Every structure is written in structure tokens, then in C-alpha cells.
Design an enzyme around this catalytic site. Structure first.
Site, short mmCIF file in Angstrom:
data_model
loop_
_atom_site.label_atom_id
_atom_site.label_comp_id
_atom_site.label_asym_id
_atom_site.label_seq_id
_atom_site.Cartn_x
_atom_site.Cartn_y
_atom_site.Cartn_z
N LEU A 161 0.85 5.71 -68.90
CA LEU A 161 -0.33 5.15 -68.21
C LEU A 161 -0.78 3.88 -68.91
O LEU A 161 -1.30 2.98 -68.27
CB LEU A 161 -1.49 6.17 -68.13
CG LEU A 161 -1.24 7.41 -67.27
CD1 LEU A 161 -2.36 8.54 -67.39
CD2 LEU A 161 -1.05 6.98 -65.79
N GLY A 162 -0.64 3.78 -70.22
CA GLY A 162 -1.18 2.61 -70.94
C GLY A 162 -0.95 2.79 -72.43
O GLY A 162 -0.66 3.93 -72.90
N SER A 163 -1.04 1.69 -73.18
CA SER A 163 -0.93 1.76 -74.63
C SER A 163 -1.76 0.64 -75.23
O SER A 163 -2.04 -0.33 -74.55
CB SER A 163 0.54 1.74 -75.10
OG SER A 163 1.08 0.42 -75.30
N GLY A 164 -2.13 0.77 -76.49
CA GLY A 164 -2.93 -0.29 -77.17
C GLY A 164 -3.44 0.19 -78.53
O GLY A 164 -2.83 1.12 -79.13
N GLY A 165 -4.53 -0.41 -79.03
CA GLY A 165 -5.22 0.03 -80.26
C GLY A 165 -5.55 1.54 -80.30
O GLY A 165 -5.73 2.10 -81.38
N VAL A 177 -0.60 6.62 -73.87
CA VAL A 177 -1.10 7.74 -73.09
C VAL A 177 -0.22 7.91 -71.90
O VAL A 177 0.02 6.93 -71.18
CB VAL A 177 -2.59 7.49 -72.58
CG1 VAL A 177 -3.12 8.66 -71.83
CG2 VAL A 177 -3.49 7.24 -73.74
N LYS A 200 -1.96 11.95 -74.99
CA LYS A 200 -2.23 10.78 -75.79
C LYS A 200 -1.64 10.91 -77.17
O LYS A 200 -1.95 11.90 -77.88
CB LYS A 200 -3.75 10.59 -75.91
CG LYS A 200 -4.14 9.43 -76.88
CD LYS A 200 -5.66 9.16 -76.72
CE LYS A 200 -6.13 7.90 -77.51
NZ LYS A 200 -7.67 7.76 -77.49
N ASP A 206 -17.66 2.61 -78.57
CA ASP A 206 -16.81 1.70 -77.79
C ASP A 206 -17.02 1.86 -76.28
O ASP A 206 -16.07 1.97 -75.47
CB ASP A 206 -15.37 1.97 -78.24
CG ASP A 206 -14.40 0.80 -77.85
OD1 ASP A 206 -14.90 -0.35 -77.57
OD2 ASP A 206 -13.18 1.10 -77.78
#
Ligand SMILES: O=C(O)c1cc2cc(Br)ccc2o1
Length: 274
Positions: free
Chosen positions: A12-16, A20, A35, A135
Site C-alpha cells: 500500500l505504501g512505504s516511507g519514514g 505497509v 506494517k 503527527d
């Protein structure tokens, strides 16, 4: 133990925050998100009512776990040699608020009002459970499209809530308050309220108000879309330069712009097409 329990779908996405994936619990076909967080990227560790050593993120998620659907629920977690894996609830169909605002532009106020009100209930829930998210932003908010319910996610930058000063922060700089930018100090609640003013501006104008440290510290707000005077007043209040001039959650929710909120289901029917 182990991963015969889940079927792994698309990234679905990735980053800091890590990576996931979409998933499905094999036993009952429940949609989940899986995750993965690398151990080397975890700077904040805690311990369970148990005493196992785990990411603070896992401690915070368990503190907020409940049937209250405004905050994401942690369903399970696993330790690996080099990572932890978190199994989280996944609404279906779902869209994050950032993507929704990319598609729709500036939100009608009625809609921003319903979303902002639910975010406020979610954050009050975190604070009641002793957890400071640190956040809050549109990328950390999921919309359960059938139900018109928002869920706060991503506690990877959060902390136990306390009444004394924080001097560390690793959430999103453009949503961080002037006192963090100038002094590297903030108190949790009034910093949360500042990020909620940035969020509400984002919803009603379709982008965040400040992109640069200098703009955050100046705190002068310009409305680039047509926004009612009551809404602008709430936003300018959340974005007060002095932390103690910011409203409390109760003052936000009693504000005249916050009155007559739609129910979540009405919200989906009118705006999300149910
Ligand atoms: O970082 C998190 O807490 C997270 C990301 C995410 C994406 C989906 Br879909 C559902 C739950 C989720 O939780």
C-alpha cells in the site's frame, strides 16, 4: 505463531513509517494491513504491562486499542530478527484523507466540519488513553468510505502524554508549531492544537498554509479559498503564536463553527456517495 495466519496482498505504501501491505486474515477473511518496521529505525522503545522490549509505537497502539472506531486498532504483532510486524485493522473500501483532498480539492465546510469533528474525538481518545500522537496530518487519517468514519493511524512518531516540556520531535515539520521551530521545546496539547489548525486549513483550502520555517514562525495566515469568517477565526485561534493563547479541545468543540455536525453515516450518504 507465524505467517500461515495472513495472506499478503499489494504493497500500500512505504516511507519514514516503514512498508505497509494489504492483507487478509486467513481464518475469517478479515481485511488487515501488515506494517513492517525495521529495528534499526526504531529510536523509541518501551515495554509492555508484560516487560517484553517493543517499539513505543506498539505500546501506544495497545494503550489506544478499543472498539472506538476513530483510532486504528492493533490486532496483533510479531517480532522478527530485524523487524517488527504489526497487524492493523483495514477498512474496505478506504482512502487516506491526503488522497481524498488531492482528488476533491478544498472541501465544502459541511464536510470539513464532520471530518474535523471526528478527528477531534479521535485525538481526545488518544489523550484520554495517555497517548500523544505528534503527527496528526491528512496522510495519517483514513476515511472508511461506506461508513463516513475517519480513523487516525500511524503512531510511529508518538509518545506517552505528559504535562512537562518535550524537547524531541520526529513528526512532520510543516505541521509543527513555532515554539518547536524556534526553541526545540513544546508542550503536547498545545502542539497538537497547532497541528489541528494546519489540518483544518488543509481541508478547507486544499493545501497546508505554511511550507517554510519562516512562515510557521511568523504565523500570518492567508486564505487562498473562500472560507467563512467563523471557520477562519477557529483556524487563526488554533494557529496562535503563543501556545497558551490556543483553544483547548473543549473550546474548539464549542466553537460556533463546530455546531450541528453531520453524523458519520449522513456524511457518507451526502458526500462520499453511499
Ligand atoms: O501506520 C499505521 O498505523 C497504518 C497504516 C495503515 C494503512 C491501512 Br489501509 C490501515 C491501517 C494502517 O495503519
Amino acid at each position: 505463531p507465524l505467517e500461515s495466519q495472513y495472506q499478503v496482498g499489494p504493497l500500500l505504501g512505504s516511507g519514514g513509517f516503514g512498508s505497509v501491505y494489504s492483507g487478509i486474515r486467513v481464518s475469517d477473511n478479515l481485511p488487515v494491513a501488515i506494517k513492517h518496521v525495521e529495528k534499526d529505525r526504531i529510536s523509541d522503545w518501551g515495554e509492555l504491562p508484560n516487560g517484553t522490549r517493543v517499539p513505543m509505537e506498539v505500546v501506544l497502539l495497545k494503550k489506544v486499542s478499543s472498539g472506538f472506531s476513530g483510532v486504528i486498532r492493533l490486532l496483533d504483532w510479531f517480532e522478527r530478527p530485524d523487524s517488527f510486524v504489526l497487524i492493523l485493522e483495514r477498512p474496505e473500501p478506504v482512502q487516506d484523507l491526503f488522497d481524498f483532498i488531492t482528488e476533491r480539492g478544498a472541501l465544502q465546510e459541511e464536510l470539513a466540519r464532520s471530518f474535523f469533528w471526528q478527528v477531534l474525538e479521535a485525538v481526545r481518545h488518544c489523550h484520554n488513553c495517555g497517548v500523544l500522537h505528534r503527527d496528526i496530518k491528512d496522510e495519517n487519517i483514513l476515511i472508511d468510505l461506506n461508513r463516513g468514519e475517519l480513523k487516525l493511524i500511524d503512531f510511529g512518531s508518538g509518545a506517552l502524554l505528559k504535562d512537562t516540556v518535550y524537547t524531541d520531535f520526529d513528526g512532520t515539520r510543516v505541521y509543527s508549531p513555532p515554539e518547536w521551530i524556534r526553541y526545540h521545546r513544546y508542550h503536547g496539547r498545545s502542539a497538537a492544537v497547532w497541528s489541528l489548525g494546519i489540518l483544518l486549513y488543509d481541508m478547507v483550502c486544499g493545501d497546508i498554509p505554511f511550507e517554510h520555517d519562516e512562515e510557521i514562525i511568523r504565523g500570518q495566515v492567508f486564505f487562498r479559498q473562500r472560507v467563512s469568517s467563523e471557520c477562519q477565526h477557529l483556524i487563526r485561534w488554533c494557529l496562535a503564536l503563543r501556545p497558551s493563547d490556543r483553544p483547548t479541545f473543549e473550546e474548539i468543540q464549542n466553537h460556533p463553527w463546530m455546531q450541528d455536525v453531520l453524523l458519520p453515516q449522513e456524511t457518507a450518504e451526502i458526500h462520499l456517495h453511499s
